[PDB]
Amino acid sequence: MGRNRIKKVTERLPLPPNARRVEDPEMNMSREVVEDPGVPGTQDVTFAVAEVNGVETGRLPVANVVVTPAHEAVVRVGTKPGTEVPPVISIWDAIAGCEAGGNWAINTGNGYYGGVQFDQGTWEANGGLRYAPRADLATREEQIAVAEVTRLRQGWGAWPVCAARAGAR
């Protein structure tokens, strides 16, 4: 018995647009872009809410109804052939922490690029142009793909401080 800590509360919340995907054969498969944000809708969501001492201790949606439907968004998704990115096998995240503080897009004008501070020749020699003109223009996972090629072909010499710091082979 006693007062019930659980009450029903109905809230009007946004209904986010579904994204309809449109292929872009000029964009890397790693990439997705919002071409049209659509228009959010609205929905009435009923929650069971627990409160003790004027403080919410829990909530659970129990019902929902569309009020205004959203207008769909349009997302462009990359389908450029040959831009498949291998799965990442995090020694690299440690290295990028050391090299660039985890900033994969770093480009300070020091002659090095991206999270693991490739020079341009090393980026190109190890296949990086498949993904981007420079390392900093490529995704983390693309940069790691090229870093793995670099390591297999040339070793850890590109990272003469950070690789050892990261506990490399």
Side-chain angles (χ1 to χ4, degrees), residues 29-159:
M29 293 169 164
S30 66
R31 307 281 192 165
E32 175 167 33
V33 142
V34 182
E35 184 174 274
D36 179 342
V39 180
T42 55
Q43 57 178 328
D44 283 335
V45 182
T46 306
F47 294 95
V49 175
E51 280 174 4
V52 171
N53 292 327
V55 189
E56 190 171 306
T57 54
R59 112 198 338 242
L60 211 245
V62 290
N64 66 276
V65 69
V66 178
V67 176
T68 303
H71 183 279
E72 73 177 2
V74 180
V75 303
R76 283 204 317 280
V77 293
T79 56
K80 185 175 177 186
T83 62
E84 288 86 356
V85 189
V88 170
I89 301 155
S90 101
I91 182 177
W92 301 110
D93 291 309
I95 291 173
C98 179
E99 292 282 3
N103 179 6
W104 289 92
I106 197 181
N107 178 13
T108 58
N110 63 353
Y112 305 99
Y113 306 90
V116 301
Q117 293 285 94
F118 274 107
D119 64 33
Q120 190 61 32
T122 301
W123 180 250
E124 302 187 5
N126 295 101
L129 300 175
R130 187 158 232 116
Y131 298 125
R134 301 191 308 265
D136 61 298
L137 296 178
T139 242
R140 164 180 173 272
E141 298 74 31
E142 292 171 344
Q143 295 181 57
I144 288 175
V146 180
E148 283 284 341
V149 167
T150 306
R151 192 237 108 219
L152 192 159
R153 294 179 39 36
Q154 300 177 330
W156 292 107
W159 310 279

Side-chain angles (χ1 to χ4, degrees), residues 6-49:
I6 307 175
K7 309 226 165 306
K8 268 183 155 179
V9 174
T10 290
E11 290 175 18
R12 188 153 282 178
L13 300 169
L15 229 194
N18 281 289
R20 92 161 209 271
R21 307 170 94 237
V22 172
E23 294 181 10
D24 182 345
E26 296 179 305
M27 185 164 29
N28 284 22
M29 293 169 164
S30 66
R31 307 281 192 165
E32 175 167 33
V33 142
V34 182
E35 184 174 274
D36 179 342
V39 180
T42 55
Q43 57 178 328
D44 283 335
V45 182
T46 306
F47 294 95
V49 175

